Amino acid sequence: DAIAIVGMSGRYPGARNVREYWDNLVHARNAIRDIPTSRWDVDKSMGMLDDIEHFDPLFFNIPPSEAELMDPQHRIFLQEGYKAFEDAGYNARTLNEKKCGVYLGIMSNEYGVMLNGNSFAIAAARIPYFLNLKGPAIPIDTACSSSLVGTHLARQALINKEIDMALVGGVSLYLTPESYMSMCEAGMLSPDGQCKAFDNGANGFVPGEGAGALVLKRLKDAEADRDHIYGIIIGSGINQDGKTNGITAPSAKSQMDLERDIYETYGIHPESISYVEMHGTGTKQGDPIELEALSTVFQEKTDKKQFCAIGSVKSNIGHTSAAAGVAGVQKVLLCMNHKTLVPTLNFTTPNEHFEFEHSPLYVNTELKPWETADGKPRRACVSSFGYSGTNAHIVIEEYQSALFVLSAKKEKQLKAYAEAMKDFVTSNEDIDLEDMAYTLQTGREAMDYRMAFLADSREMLIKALDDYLAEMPNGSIFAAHVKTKKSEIKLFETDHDAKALLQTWIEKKRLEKVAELWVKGLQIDWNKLYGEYTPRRISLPAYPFAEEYYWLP
Amino acid sequence: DAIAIVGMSGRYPGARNVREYWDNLVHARNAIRDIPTSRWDVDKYYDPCKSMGMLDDIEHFDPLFFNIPPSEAELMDPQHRIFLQEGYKAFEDAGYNARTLNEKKCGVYLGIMSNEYGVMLNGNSFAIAAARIPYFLNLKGPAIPIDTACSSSLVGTHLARQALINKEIDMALVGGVSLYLTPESYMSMCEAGMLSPDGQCKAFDNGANGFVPGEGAGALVLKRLKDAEADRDHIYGIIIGSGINQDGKTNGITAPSAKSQMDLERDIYETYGIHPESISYVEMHGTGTKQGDPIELEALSTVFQEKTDKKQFCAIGSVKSNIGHTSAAAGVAGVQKVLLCMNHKTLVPTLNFTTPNEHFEFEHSPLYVNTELKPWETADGKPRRACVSSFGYSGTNAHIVIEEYQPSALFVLSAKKEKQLKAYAEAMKDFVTSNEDIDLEDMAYTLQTGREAMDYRMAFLADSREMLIKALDDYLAEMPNGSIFAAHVKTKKSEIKLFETDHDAKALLQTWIEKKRLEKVAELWVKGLQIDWNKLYGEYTPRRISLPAYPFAEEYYWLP
């Protein structure tokens, strides 16, 4: 049937994460910059990631020596990948031995070249190795479409019950000038440094850097396991251009067959589709072909006009390549979650080679509410098309006193988390405090350095985090390093009347005591904290990895 | 349901093709050589592997055939170029040509794990490697390159299986390709303690050192069994079950996991109702590796033992003993071995085996090493079955189960250049020479309907293997006074316009065709006339068969 997306993480130009991403999208920010010479001398535009050299090897039991040898593409994805699980509320313990498939979009070995265990195959495998997953682990280079092709394959394997969970994602970095030479020599890029999407000034695209992940499961299982659900995937498909005028030329016929075959197969009526995140690289001849192809397929089922919005996040962040599909799928899910459409940039004059007026589609350039008729759930398409000629298209449909614990592998980070949660609670005025504390309990691995506290208000919660921060609270915050406190807890770990006493406090909602013990290292069955009403797992910020610098040895 | 394999092509160390492969396998030949310095100076780096299973002439390509500018060919990874060739030929093996293939939902799944050649340079993505063939023949299935390292070609096989079953594609081309062009690659593997100092994959042996690198390129055409019987293709075997998974956390990323192997193998049989007793051979991963071998063995053995007390009934073997570790191409070379054994009802030796691995006791096992050329016997009327295993150093494993499948003429040839047409003729001669029992109708039917009619043609009649061979000889020596027809199509447009346009002429041809006047049809065909070969057959139509495929120009391309 359908495929629930139950977790996400992302890192794009000018977004450290999915949140910042969505803030930027709403404020129609353009993240393209000039290429500094820290990267390379231009003696010129790129959507860039900051601090690409940064990694927390120790967290992943990697020797810092080996980290210099790792493609940063591997390292960054390893991080976002991990965090995506944490977003969904999953941790290593829960993930151990899962039939979780990993499908990793990736199309460059630049860093391995500059070297004068870096296979794609290994890149994919890092995460299963780390968290002991058992689904297949596969890297997809279909160039531009890589992350959406992986999404399709993940969809198929879930449906066909070969796996029970999937992690899909993509990652692209542009580390060497050689890569741009390749693309400039082949007349692909814009001299303006812009993906002028749908515009009649469409020059070419501007390279983007990126890394993104999605956790996927079968919708049945997701509702059952009470995960939170960003959206669902109701149809996907892939195919080829075939013989086109040059290997990297697109094929309108392939786009139409693809799009048509999908809707037909999955009983989707183009009228139901209100937005479409286009491939839309801002490319001279590409743009109008994509447009016409889609428009036409829509027109085969419906006379209705100007009802489907269109947009491309490449206008915002450039061409994020292997990561393109996943960044687009994320855009859409976020628009859905906020019932809000947002601007596609760089559009003044419609492409001359397509007349919009009589089209089912319209460019949407305004921040506005995403309205739906009836009680009919929103639906949108994401497209991605490779310069190799392998295309992918999917259709998403919208879905429909507490005890706060944190931990980390090092004290420095535990603070950083704390700072993360504070900024998160600060910025989210309406948080369900039970939900949050439930997530921190059951949806995060209990690491060696801990802290905990009680609160029954957003206010009291924040002033707990503040207190912890410069450590000056009235007094009601517990904090321990687990390895110094083994003997303060052996009792509860072994004596059967002690075990029974704890289960009495837990059972008697005596949280100050439970919090004491938990920080010291005691394993707490968090379920005994809840009788009739159990809360829900939610999206919270994920592990704030050490920002340690690794590059060539 | 099941998945028919309907075409194959292959190029491995000491086999220019699938036929040579099978000759070697039967004569238990070892193709490992010392690495000459045409490749690279082993002496310059050697210190305590100087062995490699190699392909010859890796620099050779026929760009013009694929409408590629010879300039661009120097820029192509030879891995791309070789696969592009074997890939094409695999289609031709099955009896398919461009015309027939145009616009097919045909998926391509290409195993590939190295960009060595792109590194020495300074349109060489994996993504493009895969895409070459769909671009060339206008296929519309997705085109996807798989790097799961060792297991790449078998993983692609699984994904192709799934897409066919799920009716997302109607045909699939799976394959793999590995070359070892630089010493840097061996340094990587030697430094990580992977290779044998002996230059051998001593498979299952207690002297198991490590593996020896292999080079290779292989393809399989796959379709849904229903469609294959319907379209009357020839069928090497069928795939009745496949699966993939991960090691997970093992002692080091590249260590294997017996638990993953067992779950994989067990889950497959369980899902597809396969009883280990039914399995008479298993082409193992069997890289000849110190700790890998016994784990693989135990894992399989155990799973077999969970369903059956029976003993010494399953043969095992690894073609890496014969040809080395062909890497991305490993799975496809193994699948091909098996299909050939099936076709000949013949098992063959796995090499380099004197003493069983100490860490596994065979005696009480369902399995046995088979070292002898012998008949592959089956009980009842029960079709043979075998497994192929492949396990990546990345940790993504794949395992499939194949089951055996139980079911005056006018000879035309053409090519894009005269030189090659002759080569083709030499190929067919050697093929007919070597196959005493060929059905001559089948063959001529295949040449008619299963090969694209290219610009340089020749044709002739024959009703005997003898007369057929003499024809080819005559054509080759240039002598018949004769029988044979032969034309370059572009010089002969006006000799045929008549039959192309006048409706009573068209009708006259259809009178000769219809009246089995073959000398006349052959005349016209060589000159360029399009002949509806079906009108040649009334009640009884012949079958397409495996014949040799296009003998590509052997033109040399390397760094510019």
Swiss-Prot record, chain B:
Subcellular location: Cytoplasm
Catalytic machinery residues: 150 (for beta-ketoacyl synthase 3 activity), 285 (for beta-ketoacyl synthase 3 activity), 325 (for beta-ketoacyl synthase 3 activity)
Domain named Ketosynthase family 3 (KS3): residues: 1-404
Leader sequence segment: none
Taxonomic superkingdom: Bacteria
Stated role: Involved in some intermediate steps for the synthesis of the antibiotic polyketide bacillaene which is involved in secondary metabolism.
Protein name: Polyketide synthase PksL
Coverage span on the entire protein: 2874 to 3462 of 4538
